[PDB]
């Protein structure tokens, strides 16, 4: 079956850095678009980015635009995420998922169609 | 944001929905708005995209609609394994890609 | 005049590029060289369509610059050196900066592909 | 190469239009030839031009589709389908997009025109 | 139809521009002929480009009107006048025309290059 | 003479529909570009929309774009106007109006010629 | 937006003048600033299109003029008829299209 | 090696216009950018025009924008600033200098080099 | 704006350090930050220019650093001639091309 698993640091400080990886496996990496989201203890679910299937489109939330980086390694079937500052607001379990965009050849998602078992980022 | 209520509940057996409102522009113009179920300990599950479609894998007594500027998910058949929290998400075009409402509690 | 720039700087030079472009255009022999001046004219027309600059004289392009290809300062490269200097200069490099060129306007064109899709 | 995605799905065939744009340009009979191929070549490219797509080789446009041309999903025709089987497919709309394709270019550039003319 | 406009005013007649477009490209002295008619749609589309009008058919430039080549009111021109009568109103002034649009288009791309140069 | 005559209803509830429908004589009305504007009873009188001589371009006040839409069919030389949503502060007599726009080939106008009698739209 | 007086007065045959004012960018900017003579009841007619130019149909009492950023309306030879609510408006370019004043009675 | 020589007026009344012109020796106007930067009669330095070497661009900060102009005449080795409106706020010393871009075929500067003496408009 | 000590005190045989901190996306981003010395009654001089440049006709005593979102200008060997006002200037972008501070007297 299709498996998605959240890697990366555990306790970080202020103005910091963390970098989380995701490991997929099941099926073709490079075929779905891909998005990080965050759920915190007091919060509902939000997006925080969304990748495309190549990679060379990303988007961010206005309130990370000038600190998040968003990447993926096709060849490694790894998605990553660069984060920076790291402040007590984004203290929260960060999920990655498949789905949510697609390439104008596949069709349309909008979606987060796999979600992974998630990873504790606390500051 | 999208707005959904604290919790909803009911018998078992019961059909239940779990409505979302946002704003009328993003709702309206945008038809790609989705639910998900997530249990205690898990991770959040797709269960309703489309307004109105189902993944596979999920039971067919779940189901979903778009009116105005609400969506709604609809819980046929309540059952006790069915406890989880709800949560709507709608796309809001280029500026803001997704805008989610909180968790439901059945 | 035509190529009256081209013992001028380079930068100088940059402002004739429009009188040389336009005369580039201007028994059996003769008609064959039309048809080969027609064919090489094509080919630069469409070696600039696959960048993406088919529409202008100077086209800027996303390709960052090697500085493998030649480590000369842009100062030395624009006020120093002449157009035939600097063709021999990286006269070694044109069919990777081409391939290069050509790469990256196709990871533009799917790129605008994709974002025209958001809806 | 040269029509090596030939056999490859569209989507994947996609990826290689600059080879082919790259080759297309690659007694009196063979400059009739020539001739004849210089003419196919800019009849495409004014036919391209009519359409507002300049230099593009992905050029998309503002008019929709009918389904009535083809009534296969996106996936299907993308994924499960050649470009020679697609363009047998629809060999009797061809002419019929291509009309829809310069009435829309002239709406949009006379749009265009107007947008400007406001002060 | 071709020319159908000809005796139409300039503002009907400017709806029509795509069929003669398409109409401009449709045994020594055949090949001759064939490669002259190239020649000179060449050095038509060559000179929109310098123009930065490769593209359309219809474009707006930055260079003003001088109203000494003609002082009709826009009315009077495209309500009033035919295409071929303006053509021989400013028959003595289309060369100056295309010399200030080289200029404008050369400052424009200037300009252009020095705002993407800002970061 | 011109004359411009709004049909349409004149009483909505909040959050309704309502389609007003100039009907235009007198003149070429495919020769110029048209307007809707209001005036509240108490109030001057403000422009609400502008659509192109040909209906390609609509333009509209920023406070109703989102739910206003301005159409025009030349054959019938008819004019509309078709609203949603409206709010309490939408209760005004809405005019029709010929004139505020040239497209490109004529000269230059940015002001309303010809106008109708209104119609009174209560909220 | 615009500013107008809200009435003026005069005696029959004397000149008045309606003032219009505004935002320097919208007056300045752009030379089209029209008025209009809605009398009460009626749709408002145009008086003056352009700075000053006159429409067909309008009287010589009519004339409009322009300095800085400030337009006016001038009536001479006013007439008791004449009374009626007039509005100036101009053009307040690409992102907002037309902008009005307030009405003046006499 | 380069001298900057600023003329123009003095205590002047709102509402007015004043055009302050900078003639400089040691370097020809087209080869470098030009700036107008002032001092505030308390405090310190505020940008507020910068021009290109060969005058075809303009920048301005917001605040001047509606009535500062920089233009250019190198043959003239001229420049000037034209202001209108005249903002009791705008009471400064005002500065001549150079730099502050380039046109792509020179490293690009991103700073000020030689600086005239100044004159103090005030309002 | 950029901040920027009002003042700091030198003296003979010490090193002293103005510092100057902006936006950290403006400062970040645009690798051009400059200071500029200010003599009372003068027009301001160019000092530094770039994180570590330094112009003809200015001693290696000046010299500049940068680090996160902030800068500084490190001055050692103070002479009589050194007391004026220091001043940072930092590229902005297209929106706004230069940010300054105030003035810190030695
Ligand atoms: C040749 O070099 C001289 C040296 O100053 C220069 O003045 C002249 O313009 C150069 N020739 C051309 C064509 O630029
Ligand atoms: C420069 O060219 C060499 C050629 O071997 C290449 O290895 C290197 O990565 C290039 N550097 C950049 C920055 O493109
Ligand atoms: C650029 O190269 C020229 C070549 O002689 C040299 O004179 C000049 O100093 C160089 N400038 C820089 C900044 O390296
Ligand atoms: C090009 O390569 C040859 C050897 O292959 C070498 O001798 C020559 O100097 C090179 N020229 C340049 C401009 O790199
Ligand atoms: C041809 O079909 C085989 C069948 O699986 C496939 O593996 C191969 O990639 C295909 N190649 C092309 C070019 O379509
Ligand atoms: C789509 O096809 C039907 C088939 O008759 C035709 O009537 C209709 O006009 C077509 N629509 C478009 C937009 O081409
Ligand atoms: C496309 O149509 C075929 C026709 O049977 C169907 O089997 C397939 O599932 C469809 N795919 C999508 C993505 O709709
Ligand atoms: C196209 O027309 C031919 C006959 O000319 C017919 O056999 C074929 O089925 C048609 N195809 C379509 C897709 O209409
Ligand atoms: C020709 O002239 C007649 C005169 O009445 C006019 O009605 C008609 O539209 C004109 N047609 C063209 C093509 O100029
Ligand atoms: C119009 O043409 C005349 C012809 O000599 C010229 O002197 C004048 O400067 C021109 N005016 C404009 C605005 O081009
Ligand atoms: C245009 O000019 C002619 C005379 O040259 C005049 O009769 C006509 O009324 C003018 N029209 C406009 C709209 O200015
Ligand atoms: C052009 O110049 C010739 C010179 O004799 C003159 O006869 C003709 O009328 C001129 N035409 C225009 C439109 O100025």
């Given at each position: 079956?299709?498996?998605?698993?959240?890697?990366?640091?555990?306790?970080?400080?202020?103005?910091?850095?963390?970098?989380?990886?995701?490991?997929?496996?099941?099926?073709?990496?490079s075929s779905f678009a891909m998005?990080?989201?965050?759920?915190?203890?007091?919060?509902?679910?939000?997006?925080?980015?969304?990748i495309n299937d190549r990679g060379?489109?990303?988007?961010?939330?206005?309130?990370?635009?000038?600190?998040?980086?968003?990447?993926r390694?096709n060849?490694?079937?790894?998605?990553?995420?660069?984060?920076?500052?790291?402040?007590?607001?984004?203290?929260?379990?960060?999920?990655?998922?498949?789905?949510?965009m697609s390439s104008?050849?596949q069709?349309?998602?909008?979606?987060?169609?796999?979600?992974?078992?998630?990873?504790?980022?606390?500051? | 944001?999208?707005?959904?209520?604290?919790?909803?509940?009911?018998?078992?057996?019961?059909?239940?929905?779990?409505?979302?409102?946002?704003?009328?522009?993003?709702?309206?113009?945008?038809?790609?708005?989705?639910?998900?179920?997530?249990?205690?300990?898990?991770?959040?599950?797709?269960?309703?995209?489309?307004?109105?479609?189902?993944?596979?894998?999920?039971?067919?007594?779940?189901?979903?609609?778009?009116?105005?500027?609400?969506?709604?998910?609809?819980?046929?058949?309540?059952?006790?394994?069915?406890?989880?929290?709800?949560?709507?998400?709608?796309?809001?075009?280029?500026?803001?890609?997704?805008?989610?409402?909180?968790?439901?509690?059945? | 005049?035509?190529?009256?720039?081209?013992?001028?700087?380079?930068?100088?030079?940059?402002?004739?590029?429009?009188?040389?472009?336009?005369?580039?255009?201007?028994?059996?022999?003769?008609?064959?060289?039309?048809?080969?001046?027609?064919?090489?004219?094509?080919?630069?027309?469409?070696?600039?369509?696959?960048?993406?600059?088919?529409?202008?004289?100077?086209?800027?392009?996303?390709?960052?610059?090697?500085?493998?290809?030649?480590?000369?300062?842009?100062?030395?490269?624009?006020?120093?050196?002449?157009?035939?200097?600097?063709?021999?200069?990286?006269?070694?490099?044109?069919?990777?900066?081409?391939?290069?060129?050509?790469?990256?306007?196709?990871?533009?064109?799917?790129?605008?592909?994709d974002?025209?899709?958001?809806?």
């Open positions: 079956e299709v498996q998605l698993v959240e890697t990366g640091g555990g306790l970080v400080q202020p103005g910091g850095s963390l970098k989380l990886s995701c490991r997929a496996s099941g099926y073709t990496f998005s990080w989201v965050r759920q915190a203890p007091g919060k509902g679910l939000e997006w925080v980015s969304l060379g489109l990303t988007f961010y939330v206005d309130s990370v635009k000038g600190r998040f980086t968003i990447s390694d060849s490694k079937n790894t998605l990553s995420l660069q984060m920076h500052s790291l402040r007590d607001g984004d203290t929260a379990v960060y999920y990655c998922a498949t789905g949510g104008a050849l069709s349309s998602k909008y979606y987060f169609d796999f979600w992974g078992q998630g990873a504790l980022v606390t500051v | 944001a999208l707005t959904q209520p604290p919790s909803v509940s009911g018998s078992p057996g019961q059909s239940v929905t779990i409505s979302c409102t946002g704003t009328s522009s993003d709702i309206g113009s945008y038809n790609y708005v989705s639910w998900y179920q997530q249990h205690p300990g898990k991770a959040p599950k797709l269960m309703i995209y489309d307004v109105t479609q189902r993944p596979s894998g999920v039971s067919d007594r779940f189901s979903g609609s778009k009116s105005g500027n609400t969506a709604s998910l609809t819980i046929s058949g309540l059952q006790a394994d069915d406890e989880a929290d709800y949560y709507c998400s709608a796309y809001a075009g280029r500026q803001t890609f997704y805008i989610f409402g909180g968790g439901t509690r059945l | 005049g035509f190529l009256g720039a081209a013992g001028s700087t380079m930068g100088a030079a940059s402002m004739t590029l429009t009188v040389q472009a336009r005369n580039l255009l201007s028994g059996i022999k003769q008609l064959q060289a039309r048809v080969l001046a027609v064919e090489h004219y094509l080919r630069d027309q469409q070696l600039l369509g696959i960048w993406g600059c088919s529409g202008k004289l100077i086209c800027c392009t996303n390709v960052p610059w090697n500085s493998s290809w030649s480590n000369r300062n842009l100062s030395e490269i624009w006020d120093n050196m002449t157009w035939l200097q600097w063709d021999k200069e990286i006269s070694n490099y044109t069919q990777i900066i081409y391939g290069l060129l050509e790469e990256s306007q196709n990871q533009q064109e799917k790129n605008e592909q974002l025209l899709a958001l809806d």
